[PDB]
Amino acid sequence: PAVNPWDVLLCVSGTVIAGENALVVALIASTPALRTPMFVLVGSLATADLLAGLGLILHFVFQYLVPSETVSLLTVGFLVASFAASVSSLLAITVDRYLSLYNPLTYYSRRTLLGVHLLLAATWTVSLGLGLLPVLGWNCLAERAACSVVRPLARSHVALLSAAFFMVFGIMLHLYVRICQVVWRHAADLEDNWETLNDNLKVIEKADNAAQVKDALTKMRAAALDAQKATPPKLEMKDFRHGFDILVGQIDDALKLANEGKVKEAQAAAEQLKTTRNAYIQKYLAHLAATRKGVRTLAVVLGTFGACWLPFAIYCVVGSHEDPAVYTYATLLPATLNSMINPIIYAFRNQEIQRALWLLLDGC
């Protein structure tokens, strides 16, 4: 028993990672529709995870099948660059999601596409550099007292890697809270205006004087428009939104009658407003149910990223080369599992990626 079980587990993990992310890469590459900034970023993440998966397999190969210290230095440097590129790609994705939420219009501009190009060129340039430094000689091959828990990386180089991870993670947390903030605000405004919409509709049905009817119709018009704004836009869906378009229209019809002195007729028009409102009551509950689920996903995915990488990042600066290798393996394996989760969260859950997959399975 000279093969270490953990090395086999990493090879298995790398195989799953490579297979998952190779499929994502193939789907985006062969689908001209998937060329927006968002998908350029997903393709970068998938490529990095693909490279990291292959790297785990290669590390096994040149440890056990072609024993080579030199090529093992290359494989570890390869993995440093691949995981750096994956973590930095997650940062870039998060930046993009922030910008699309905070700039519902100016996000769709030439600057945004330029920004992804420059950001990815920079993250990949830095990622490669980080893996190239040990290959060029910033390693512990000469001085074994300077070895980190991941051979043959030098403790000082690994400290830099962990510092970069902590900074990247801190930025993601900042963006996460801002994203969370915007999603909560819009959901709160939608639920507010929807409730006031219903309140005034009851005022109409129970009105006893004409002043109440006009007042309630005036508030319904404002609430309808505010509820529309809080709904995310179609693109660059708008069916739930267009439900408010015909509500404003009906409210304007009732207001016209009320202003001409036909308040009885304006009140009776609430039956039609209640009919309209009831038709979109499910789309409203479904939208609130989707945002709720999305918020949960946000936190779960970021928490899982932290649970997978933080123990490793911490142990890499606290541990030393004297520790048994199992503690490096036990903290490294979860970090690799995150590269199995990434394609599911950022690629396979996307409807356009699923469509490309359907066209691929069905022979186009």
Ligand X SMILES: CCCCCCCC/C=C\CCCCCCCC(=O)OC[C@H](O)CO
Ligand Y SMILES: CC(C)CCC[C@@H](C)[C@H]1CC[C@H]2[C@@H]3CC=C4C[C@@H](O)CC[C@]4(C)[C@H]3CC[C@]12C
Q: Quick check: 114 binds ligand OLA (CB under 6 A)? A: no
**SS3 state of residue 147:** strand
238 secondary structure, DSSP code: -
Picked from ligand Y, ligand OLA, ligand X, none, the partner binding residue 115 (CB below 5 to 8 A depending on kind) is ligand X
Tell me the residue type at 311: P
Q: How far is CA 234 from the centre of its chain?
A: 19
Q: Quick check: 100 binds ligand OLA (CB under 6 A)? A: no
Picked from ligand OLA, ligand Y, ligand X, none, the partner binding residue 284 (CB below 5 to 8 A depending on kind) is none
Q: Quick check: 334 binds ligand X (CB under 6 A)? A: yes
> According to CB under 6 A, which one of 24, 58, 120, 217 is a site residue for ligand OLA?
58
Distance of closest approach, residue 181 Cβ to ligand Y, in angstroms: 29
Binding site for ligand Y (CB under 6 A): 40, 43-44, 47, 51, 78, 81-82, 85, 120, 124, 128, 131
User: What stretches of the chain adopt beta strand conformation (E)?
Assistant: none
∠ Cα 140 141 146 (to 5°): 25
Lookup: tokens for 24: 């994502």
Q: 134 vs 232, which CB is nearer to ligand Y?
A: 134
CA-to-CA separations, 152 to 138, 142, 147, 162, 361, in angstroms, rounded: 9, 10, 6, 16, 43
Binding-residue pattern over the window 146 to 185 for ligand X, x denoting contact by CB under 6 A: ------------------x--xx--x--------------
Q: Under rule CB under 6 A, which residues in 132-191 are in contact with ligand OLA? A: 132-133, 136-138, 150-151, 154-155, 158-159, 161-171, 174, 178
Distance of closest approach, residue 29 Cβ to ligand OLA, in angstroms: 4
What is the spatial distance between Cα 293 and Cα 357, in angstroms, rounded to a whole number? 24
What is the spatial distance between Cα 100 and Cα 94, in angstroms, rounded to a whole number? 10
What is the spatial distance between Cα 258 and Cα 295, in angstroms, rounded to a whole number? 43
Lookup: tokens for 16: 């799953």
Q: 78 vs 346, which CB is nearer to ligand X?
A: 78
Most distant CA pair in the chain: distance in Å?
A: 95
What is the spatial distance between Cα 116 and Cα 356, in angstroms, rounded to a whole number? 23
What is the spatial distance between Cα 284 and Cα 190, in angstroms, rounded to a whole number? 9
Residues in contact with ligand OLA by CB under 6 A are 4-6, 8-9, 12, 16, 23, 25, 28-29, 43, 47, 51, 54, 57-59, 61, 66, 76, 79-80, 83-84, 87-88, 122-123, 125-129, 132-133, 136-138, 150-151, 154-155, 158-159, 161-171, 174, 178, 312-313, 316-317, 325-326, 328, 332, 360-361, 363
